[PDB]
Amino acid sequence: NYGYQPLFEDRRPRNIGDTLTIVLQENVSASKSSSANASRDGKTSFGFDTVPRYLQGL
């Protein structure tokens, strides 16, 4: 005797020793990315090509 068995219920595992089908379908995907930047450019100039007389000493 295997005990009471439901008639219309779907066949499910209920006790120790019962079998069950596992459909292994795994799809995992993780990603991450980052960046940082900094820039600085500086140019400066001053030139006196021709200096008038009253400015010579300066």
Binding site: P6, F8, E9, D10, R12
Partner: protein, 54 residues
Amino acid sequence: ERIRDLTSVQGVRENSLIGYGLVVGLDGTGDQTTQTPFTTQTLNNMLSQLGITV
């Protein structure tokens, strides 16, 4: 027999209860279930509870 008709006793009151269910056995006069997804969803829930997985 007039005081019982004019007053109420403190603590002796009525409450309101609400719930959701399914009514079966209709003669083709039930939900269309195409415009009411919850009918089929809860029927599937009941069947799953009873052991049938649609």
